[PDB]
Amino acid sequence: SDGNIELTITGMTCASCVHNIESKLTRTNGITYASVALATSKALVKFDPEIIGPRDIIKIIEEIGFHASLAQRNPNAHHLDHKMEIKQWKKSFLCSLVFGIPVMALMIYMLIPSNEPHQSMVLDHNIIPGLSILNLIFFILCTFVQLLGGWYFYVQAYKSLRHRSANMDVLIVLATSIAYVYSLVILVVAVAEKAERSPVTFFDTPPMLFVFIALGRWLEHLAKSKTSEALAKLMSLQATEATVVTLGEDNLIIREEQVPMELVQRGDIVKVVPGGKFPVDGKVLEGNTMADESLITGEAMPVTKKPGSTVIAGSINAHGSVLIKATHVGNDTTLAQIVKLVEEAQMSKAPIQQLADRFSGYFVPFIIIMSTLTLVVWIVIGFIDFGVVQRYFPNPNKHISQTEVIIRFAFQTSITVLCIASPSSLGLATPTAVMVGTGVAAQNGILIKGGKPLEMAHKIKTVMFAKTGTITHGVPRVMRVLLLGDVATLPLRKVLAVVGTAEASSEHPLGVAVTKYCKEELGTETLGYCTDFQAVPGCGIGCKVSNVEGILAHFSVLIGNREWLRRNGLTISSDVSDAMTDHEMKGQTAILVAIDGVLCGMIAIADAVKQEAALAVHTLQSMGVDVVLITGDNRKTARAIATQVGINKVFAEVLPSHKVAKVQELQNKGKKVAMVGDGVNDSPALAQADMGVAIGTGTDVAIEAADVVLIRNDLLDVVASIHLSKRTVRRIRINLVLALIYNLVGIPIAAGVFMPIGIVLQPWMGSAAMAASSVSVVLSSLQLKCYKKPDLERYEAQAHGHMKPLTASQVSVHIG
Ligand SMILES: [Pt+2]
Numbered sequence: 001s002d003g004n005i006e007l008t009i010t011g012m013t014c015a016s017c018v019h020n021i022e023s024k025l026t027r028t029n030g031i032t033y034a035s036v037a038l039a040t041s042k043a044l045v046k047f048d049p050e051i052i053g054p055r056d057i058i059k060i061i062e063e064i065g066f067h068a069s070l071a072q073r074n075p076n077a078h079h080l081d082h083k084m085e086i087k088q089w090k091k092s093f094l095c096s097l098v099f100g101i102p103v104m105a106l107m108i109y110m111l112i113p114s115n116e117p118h119q120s121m122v123l124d125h126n127i128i129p130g131l132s133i134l135n136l137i138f139f140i141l142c143t144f145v146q147l148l149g150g151w152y153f154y155v156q157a158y159k160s161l162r163h164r165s166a167n168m169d170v171l172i173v174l175a176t177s178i179a180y181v182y183s184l185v186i187l188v189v190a191v192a193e194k195a196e197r198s199p200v201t202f203f204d205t206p207p208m209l210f211v212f213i214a215l216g217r218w219l220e221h222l223a224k225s226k227t228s229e230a231l232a233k234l235m236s237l238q239a240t241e242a243t244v245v246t247l248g249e250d251n252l253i254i255r256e257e258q259v260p261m262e263l264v265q266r267g268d269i270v271k272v273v274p275g276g277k278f279p280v281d282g283k284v285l286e287g288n289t290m291a292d293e294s295l296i297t298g299e300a301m302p303v304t305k306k307p308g309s310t311v312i313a314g315s316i317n318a319h320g321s322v323l324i325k326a327t328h329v330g331n332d333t334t335l336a337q338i339v340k341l342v343e344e345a346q347m348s349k350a351p352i353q354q355l356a357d358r359f360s361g362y363f364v365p366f367i368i369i370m371s372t373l374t375l376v377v378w379i380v381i382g383f384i385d386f387g388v389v390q391r392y393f394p395n396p397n398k399h400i401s402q403t404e405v406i407i408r409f410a411f412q413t414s415i416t417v418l419c420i421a422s423p424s425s426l427g428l429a430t431p432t433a434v435m436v437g438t439g440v441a442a443q444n445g446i447l448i449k450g451g452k453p454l455e456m457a458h459k460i461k462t463v464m465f466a467k468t469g470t471i472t473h474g475v476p477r478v479m480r481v482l483l484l485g486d487v488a489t490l491p492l493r494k495v496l497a498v499v500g501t502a503e504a505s506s507e508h509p510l511g512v513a514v515t516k517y518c519k520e521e522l523g524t525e526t527l528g529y530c531t532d533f534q535a536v537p538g539c540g541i542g543c544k545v546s547n548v549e550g551i552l553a554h555f556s557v558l559i560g561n562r563e564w565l566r567r568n569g570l571t572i573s574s575d576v577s578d579a580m581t582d583h584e585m586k587g588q589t590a591i592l593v594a595i596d597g598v599l600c601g602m603i604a605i606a607d608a609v610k611q612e613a614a615l616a617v618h619t620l621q622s623m624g625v626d627v628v629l630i631t632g633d634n635r636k637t638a639r640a641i642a643t644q645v646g647i648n649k650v651f652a653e654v655l656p657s658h659k660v661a662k663v664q665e666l667q668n669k670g671k672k673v674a675m676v677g678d679g680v681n682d683s684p685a686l687a688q689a690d691m692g693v694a695i696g697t698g699t700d701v702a703i704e705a706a707d708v709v710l711i712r713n714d715l716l717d718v719v720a721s722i723h724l725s726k727r728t729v730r731r732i733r734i735n736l737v738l739a740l741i742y743n744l745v746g747i748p749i750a751a752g753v754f755m756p757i758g759i760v761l762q763p764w765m766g767s768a769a770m771a772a773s774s775v776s777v778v779l780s781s782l783q784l785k786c787y788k789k790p791d792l793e794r795y796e797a798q799a800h801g802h803m804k805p806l807t808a809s810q811v812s813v814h815i816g
Contacts, residue, residue, distance in 0.1 A: 015427020216771025
């Protein structure tokens, strides 16, 4: 609501444009944030709304030199497809192959000596003093290459040089221009002086530079396109046509229509045939069927659906034809929300990613300075102290004087050094790994958002679980109802009816269960009236019940915890004090009933802890992560459930009001704490925590407090979320090393420092060793896709043997 804009930018090729754009925008006044995604080719900028407008931002971007526009909503396939660039680079490589074969054949013909040559390689027979026929062929071919093959690089360098910054094609244009001009000058000098020998010239490298450049830039885009498979599959999964039906009286088909999604609205009725996708989320009206959504939520078992259930826009129907009423259409569907969340997942760049952006904006000038320094130092060392170099070039050649060999060596070693740098491999090391990790997570239910939580989960030491809806099933079962007061004037029917009618006003999770229970044993569909319903969260409810004859034909009611009756001034007895103890330490909480000050009786209410809770708590304990449980229930109830799962420290009697101070005090020691909440209920608690985990939120992934969202209601996915985040963060570190070892080794070698050992590279060898670098970085990222989701028996394996039981004695409780 702060005028936060999202833009799409076309034309970002080099990895150095991101730093330029971000610095130019942030340095401009009135802007506090700017994130640019090279892979997605978009931008996310927030600013002060009144000072500047979106058109001003577009104008600034156009001034920088990029074409930008407002973000579109549905069309994203071509951005993530990379079709145009792959096709163009493949076409360019095939086009440039026609001039790489002849020069390569001529070069290889020179090297291998024939055992019985026809004339002993007279292909270098001079015709005009200084101009051999070989050099004529090479000159013609190189002129055609420069006037026909390097045009695109010339255009890119010209458009980048119009502004202060320099992209990565400057290196290519400089290399080719120098290798052309020096050779042309030396050839003209040789011809004019009428020398007998044609000097060795630099007319062979431009033909071999462009072939390797195009091959590298084609393979690199072909490898990139495999990183966006998850987004491509998710986006190209929603349907575009629906079968609109109209119901006369008894859901009878009046008529049929086919409508696009942009015209269908909420409340419409649509039918699906077997084998067809559900176009819109909605409520099942009639018909029994079952559908599988393994491409949406990641589960393998196909869910069964009955009239009155919900559907997911994207699942495939199997049995029969079913009519449903549309509820969410368009951007409101779960699939659209998932796609959007994953899209802005690659926007919050990590600090290491920001450093990598900063380093790659100051790379090309560094390479140019290093190349010029190498050229000058080689010339001066050759011209001043020839002894050191002639120790390794001792041969005296009459055809070319020793002055001319030093210059040629200096030029060769100053061209190879700037022809071997690979800024792109350093630029795209981390973004590809981040994208692949997020996609492989999203295809498994875990819905990690943002790049910061990726490395946040690496160093978390304490995890925090809530009780209801997170550890246990969340749908409580009523065990039994006990009566403590009178039986004649307070029969079972009366007390259950009045408590059910009293709680019917409320919506607290445990009370709806007891109300529906009361309905099911009394068998009465009617109910009375409740008035003066005082509802204090975390304390209890107090009210009065009227119209008590509705159910009894077949009243100040105070319901709450023990202190709730203390607040209303009700006495303390001993038989009631140990009444729930028989059940309280068995893991079922108990609610006490007192109407008009009369201790009517007690009810035991239970909710079963999920099976997975036994192992998920232990794996984190063995993985090096501590665990703490928090709840607002009684201390004895927390103690019982803590032992059943194995958490030593618990925070009980926490009223739902504060629930942030306990998180606050844990973070006060400098450690990192992440809480596993439930969603809309515990939004303030998740936001304060460093990483928010929202578990069991099906088709409600639009959560802003939490930075990690889990669709399936499984505690083991918490383990997989941490276990997969570590496996990703390690990949950036490995990727950022291969881009530094290669550069800090390929520069000295191309600088000719290894001359005494006797290893020197011609420039064409300085490009074939660069195209392999860019692809190798991407190929190291794609290895993450080989990730099998661990199964229940998988965790049973490494956890087998050692499961240490614990008793309530070694269980601490809260403080204050
Ligand atoms: Pt380059």
